[PDB]
């Protein structure tokens, strides 16, 4: 990385952080070239790193953001703005509202500045189509152009899909897959790629744990499947793991446990959608693999 | 609550539009991300030009007849199921009904000043009743259930057309879109490129994620700058000669095609298209 690009990167981060604590609705306007530069440079970093991340503590694991940029700035207040802390996000950075651009541009800016201390996984909202998601595509063509959205899809196609923290915590957006027997299957997935409608990559971003299902059941989303509690236990024993860390679903207190606290669902976007008054959570992992949970109030 | 031109009440957890008549010179009212469940006391805000109800719980469009000067109406990401209550807004120039539950296009016959119509992410199944919108510059119908392109002949002023993520199977009905400059038909079921003879002003053509197997019938699109054809079935390298007439072409997407299996994929494109500076996601050296 050049030093002239470092100072331009510091300018982007500074302008994105000037609205900290302001009105939840104020926007930061970056030039189209600066946003594209964030997409292209971070795309090279995503491809230069494994599609299955192998991370080490300490780091803080956050859930869904859903374009709530002012709740992202709150996460960095509780946990510490980089590089004060290492971060791992579990996808779904863009959605409704008109702040999904500032959300993804700040995360990509931190990814470029701290490539080995800041990590982003791929959620089901980081797809390359508008078959199911339309909010982010609507925001791009509206503040800029449709081509800028196409550049984001190029960057989204290179995002990693799963992460293993200290060989004990398996992290992904959706959950387990009926086609996931060895971790090499995840590394075997080549990038860039669009999220398919079926297979290993699809279930890693769409599956959900269910309490009333034994084995693999149909998902009410119409995509992927749902897995039961006993499926999680055999996955942890087979691969010698201690915890599955996922997101995708909304939970009231920001985190919820499944299969006798062998799986946790992290949701870091408080007050999601309308009147459902959920909170945000952030799981910290220290050097001895001890998990603490910080809660953010809506 | 002051008396200025702009009033911005986003994420204020407001559940009722109560007591807004105090504004004497309000021109833009922003009520995004609230608990508003019905449109109510907006009558005395006659001087209103922009109304933004982005992401609320509105189920019915109503009580908007007094705003005869309204130009921009945004009721996106709500619970709307039918189009109504917009017949009095004669000077509407922008209408946003994004991500609702609208099933058909209707009650838009009086909007003679509309330049932009956003009906994306709905349940629309047919293109209907837009024959009176002769001043439309942009029509967004992405993410729906439309099966056939039709009833577009009156939109001679249309410049941008987005039909992504629908159920189309053949390109047609663009015979009178002579001023069309951007066309997006990605993620459909189109199998052949045809019906673009009258659209010479095209600068953007997106037909990715379809079932196209040969590049034909675009020799006359000399103004092409962007051509997105990823996720198709292109097999013949000789088809790229159809695009040699576009000397301002800067970007081509051809990845995840049978042509990308060639060990010299990125070189044969920039040799056949020397004007292109971006192949797929990366730039040309
Ligand atoms: Cl790149
Ligand atoms: Cl780093
Ligand atoms: Cl293994
Ligand atoms: Mn999700």
From Swiss-Prot, chain A:
Pfam families: Metallophos, STPPase_N. Mn(2+) 1 binds at residues 64, 66, 92. Changing residue 50 to R: Promotes SMP complex formation. GO terms for cellular component: adherens junction; cytoplasm; cytosol; dendritic spine; extracellular exosome; glutamatergic synapse; glycogen granule; nucleolus. The phosphatase activity of the PPP1R15A-PP1 complex toward EIF2S1 is specifically inhibited by Salubrinal, a drug that protects cells from endoplasmic reticulum stress. GO terms for biological process: branching morphogenesis of an epithelial tube; cell division; circadian regulation of gene expression; dephosphorylation; entrainment of circadian clock by photoperiod; glycogen metabolic process; lung development; negative regulation of transcription elongation by RNA polymerase II. Signal peptide: none annotated. It is an enzyme of class 3 (hydrolase). Keywords: Acetylation, Carbohydrate metabolism, Cell cycle, Cell division, Cytoplasm, Glycogen metabolism, Host-virus interaction, Hydrolase, Manganese, Metal-binding, Nucleus, Phosphoprotein, Protein phosphatase. Its cofactor is Fe cation; Mn(2+). Coiled coil: none annotated. Binds 1 Fe cation per subunit. Binds 2 manganese ions per subunit. The active site is at residue 125. It is found in: Cytoplasm; Nucleus; Nucleus, Nucleoplasm; Nucleus, Nucleolus. Phosphorylated. Induction: Up-regulated in synovial fluid mononuclear cells and peripheral blood mononuclear cells from patients with rheumatoid arthritis. GO terms for molecular function: cadherin binding involved in cell-cell adhesion; iron ion binding; phosphatase activity; phosphoprotein phosphatase activity; protein phosphatase 1 binding; protein serine/threonine phosphatase activity; ribonucleoprotein complex binding; RNA polymerase II CTD heptapeptide repeat S5 phosphatase activity. It catalyses: O-phospho-L-seryl-[protein] + H2O = L-seryl-[protein] + phosphate; O-phospho-L-threonyl-[protein] + H2O = L-threonyl-[protein] + phosphate. Its EC number is 3.1.3.16. The modification Phosphoserine is found at residues 2, 22. CDD domains: MPP_PP1_PPKL (cd07414). Mn(2+) 2 binds at residues 64, 92, 124, 173, 248. PP1 comprises a catalytic subunit, PPP1CA, PPP1CB or PPP1CC, which is folded into its native form by inhibitor 2 and glycogen synthetase kinase 3, and then complexed to one or several targeting or regulatory subunits. PPP1R12A, PPP1R12B and PPP1R12C mediate binding to myosin. PPP1R3A (in skeletal muscle), PPP1R3B (in liver), PPP1R3C, PPP1R3D and PPP1R3F (in brain) mediate binding to glycogen. Interacts with PPP1R39. Interacts with BTBD10. Interacts with KCTD20. Interacts with PPP1R9A and PPP1R9B. Part of a complex containing PPP1R15B, PP1 and NCK1/2. Belongs to the PPP phosphatase family. PP-1 subfamily. This is Serine/threonine-protein phosphatase PP1-alpha catalytic subunit. It comes from Homo sapiens (Human). The lineage of its organism: Eukaryota, Metazoa, Chordata, Craniata, Vertebrata.
From Swiss-Prot, chain B:
GO terms for molecular function: enzyme regulator activity; protein phosphatase regulator activity. Its main location: nucleus. Changing residue 228 to A: Completely abolishes the interaction with protein phosphatase 1. It is found in: Nucleus. Widely expressed. One of its GO terms (cellular component) is extracellular exosome. Signal peptide: none annotated. LRR repeats lie at residues 3-24, 25-46, 47-68, 69-90, 91-112, 113-134, 135-156, 157-178, 179-200, 201-222, 223-244. It comes from the Eukaryota. Regulatory subunit of protein phosphatase 1. Belongs to the SDS22 family. Interacts with PPP1CA, PPP1CB and PPP1CC/PPP1G isoform 1. This is Protein phosphatase 1 regulatory subunit 7. It comes from Homo sapiens (Human). The lineage of its organism: Eukaryota, Metazoa, Chordata, Craniata, Vertebrata. The gene is PPP1R7. The chain holds residues 75 to 359 of 360 of the full protein.
């Amino acid at each position: 990385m050049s030093d002239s690009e470092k100072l331009n990167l510091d300018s982007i981060i500074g302008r994105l952080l000037e609205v900290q604590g302001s009105r939840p609705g104020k926007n930061v306007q970056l030039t189209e070239n600066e946003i594209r530069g964030l997409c292209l440079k971070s795309r090279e970093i995503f491809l230069s790193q494994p599609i299955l991340l192998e991370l080490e503590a300490p780091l803080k694991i956050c859930g869904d953001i859903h374009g709530q940029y002012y709740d992202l700035l709150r996460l960095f207040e509780y946990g510490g703005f980089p590089p004060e802390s290492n971060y791992l996000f579990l996808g779904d950075y863009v959605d409704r509202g008109k702040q999904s651009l500032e959300t993804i541009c700040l995360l990509l800016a931190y990814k470029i500045k701290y490539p080995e201390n800041f990590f982003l996984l791929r959620g089901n909202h980081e797809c390359a189509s508008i078959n199911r998601i339309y909010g982010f595509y609507d925001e791009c063509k509206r503040r800029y152009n449709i081509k800028l959205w196409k550049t984001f899809t190029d960057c989204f196609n290179c995002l990693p899909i799963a992460a293993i923290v200290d060989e004990k915590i398996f992290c992904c957006h959706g959950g387990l897959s009926p086609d996931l027997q060895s971790m090499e299957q995840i590394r075997r997935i080549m990038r860039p790629t669009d999220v398919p409608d079926q297979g290993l990559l699809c279930d890693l971003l769409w599956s959900d744990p269910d309490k009333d299902v034994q084995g693999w059941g149909e998902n009410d989303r119409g995509v992927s499947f749902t897995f039961g509690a006993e499926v999680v236990a055999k996955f942890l024993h087979k691969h010698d793991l201690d915890l599955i860390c996922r997101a995708h679903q909304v939970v009231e207190d920001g985190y919820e446990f499944f299969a006798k606290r062998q799986l946790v669902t992290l949701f870091s976007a408080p007050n999601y959608c309308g009147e459902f008054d959920n909170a945000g959570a952030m799981m910290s992992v220290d050097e001895t693999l001890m998990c603490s949970f910080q809660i953010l109030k809506p | 609550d002051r008396d200025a031109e702009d009033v911005d009440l986003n994420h204020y957890r407001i559940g009722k539009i109560e007591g807004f008549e105090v504004l004497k010179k309000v021109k833009t009212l922003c009520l995004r991300q609230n608990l508003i469940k019905c449109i109510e006391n907006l009558e005395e805000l006659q001087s209103l030009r922009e109304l933004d109800l982005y992401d609320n719980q509105i189920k019915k469009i109503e009580n908007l007849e007094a705003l005869t000067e309204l130009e921009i109406l945004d009721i996106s990401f709500n619970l709307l199921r039918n189009i109504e209550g917009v017949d009095k807004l004669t000077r509407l120039k922008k209408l946003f009904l994004v991500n609702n539950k609208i099933s058909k296009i209707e009650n838009l016959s009086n909007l003679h000043q509309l330049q932009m119509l956003e009906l994306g992410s709905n349940r629309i199944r047919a293109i209907e009743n837009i024959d009176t919108l002769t001043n439309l510059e942009s029509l967004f119908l992405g993410k729906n259930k439309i099966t056939k392109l039709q009833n577009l002949d009156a939109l001679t002023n249309l410049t941008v057309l987005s039909m992504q993520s629908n159920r189309l199977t053949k390109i047609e009905g663009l015979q009178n879109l002579v001023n069309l400059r951007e066309l997006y038909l990605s993620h459909n079921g189109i199998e052949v490129i045809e019906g673009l003879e009258n659209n010479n002003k095209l600068t953007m053509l997106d037909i990715a994620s379809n079932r196209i197997k040969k590049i034909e019938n675009i020799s006359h699109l000399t103004e092409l700058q962007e051509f997105w054809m990823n996720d198709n079935l292109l097999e013949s390298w000789s088809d790229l000669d159809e695009l040699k007439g576009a000397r301002s072409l800067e970007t081509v997407y051809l990845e995840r095609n049978p042509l990308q299996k060639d060990p010299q994929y990125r070189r044969k494109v920039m040799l056949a298209l020397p004007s292109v500076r971006q192949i797929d996601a990366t730039f040309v050296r």
